Amino acid sequence: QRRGFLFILSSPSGAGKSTLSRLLLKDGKLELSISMTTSKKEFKRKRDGNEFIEWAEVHGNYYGTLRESVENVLSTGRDMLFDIDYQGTKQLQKKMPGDTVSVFILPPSMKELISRLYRRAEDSQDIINLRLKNARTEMQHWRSYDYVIINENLNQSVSLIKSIYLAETVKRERCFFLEPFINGLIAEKI
Amino acid sequence: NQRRGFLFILSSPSGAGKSTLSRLLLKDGKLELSISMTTRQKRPSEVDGLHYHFISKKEFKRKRDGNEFIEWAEVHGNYYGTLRESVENVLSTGRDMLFDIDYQGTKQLQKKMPGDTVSVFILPPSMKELISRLYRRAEDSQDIINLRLKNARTEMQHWRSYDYVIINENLNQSVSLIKSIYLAETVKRERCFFLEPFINGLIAEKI
């Protein structure tokens, strides 16, 4: 009845990604994308063939989403969740116009962002300060997002994100069933 | 006024449940209802100022020549219009307005205030369901019913003017959707002008 879209969530410091993602995947309406990771020669071949809708190098290995694998899902009306950074977001939005919905999630304050990082004991003060620097770089790209949420309350934020998702499932442009259905109401014999 | 107010436009073929959905959407107070001026004669059960301001054809004409209407249309043989001053006043406070109008008013608002309107078209699941709701509603003479059907068809011809289309299959689900559309648009980036100084605040904050 409708085309699926790629649901793109980004956060400076990307903190609580596993939690917010898990909360949005629980009911099953969103599919997680299975990324190809590092043959190395197939990655370059698929990249040189424009097979990737998104690609990045993380910790010395390549990760990518294949255009074919995403296009299969969206044609069936199933939506896909992406917890990625600005670099991935810009690649998808350029490649999939009309099929992307991007949400940027901001901290209520840097003081609160620092507090959350200082509750991840596996992070030295240096790593904390490096995460703060990357957070400031990411926040500068906020204008590339359809929606921006200030995470003042995680429960409110989950509610808002779910509303964004629900709202986008009934956008006129992606509900291709509307034209024959509405013509059918207009022509129905009474 | 941390973000731009917007005009939340609900349209439906008469008998698809727009009026009931509007009442439920007004309950939590975030939306203010737009009161249209009208040249329709006030019905015995109506009260001026609750849904319409009932004025004369000459007074409607004079308001139109004085540019007082941000939007006006002839709907079912009577004139209806929204005063620009009433919209300006609600939106200056950063507040959102609920609108109960047809496609003619919708198109004017979208052309004058691009980006500040959110339009939702509500459809029946069938015309049989539409007729079933029209009978259950009123004193239900066949003439009024046929004519409401004709109007319903003409309004549905203009569905491409609407940002969202909802098929009213379940009333609770329909309320959930429209409320979800409302909430999503309050956090739409292009109307949150507060963002830039707040994010510059986050980037320039001392750590």
Swiss-Prot record, chain B:
HAMAP family: Guanylate_kinase (MF_00328). It comes from Bartonella henselae (strain ATCC 49882 / DSM 28221 / CCUG 30454 / Houston 1). Pfam families: Guanylate_kin. The lineage of its organism: Bacteria, Pseudomonadati, Pseudomonadota, Alphaproteobacteria, Hyphomicrobiales. GO terms for molecular function: ATP binding; guanylate kinase activity. Residues 5-183 form the Guanylate kinase-like domain. Belongs to the guanylate kinase family. NCBIfam families: guanyl_kin (TIGR03263). This is Guanylate kinase. Coiled coil: none annotated. InterPro entries: GK/Ca_channel_bsu, Guanylate_kin-like_dom, Guanylate_kinase, Guanylate_kinase_CS, P-loop_NTPase. The gene is gmk.
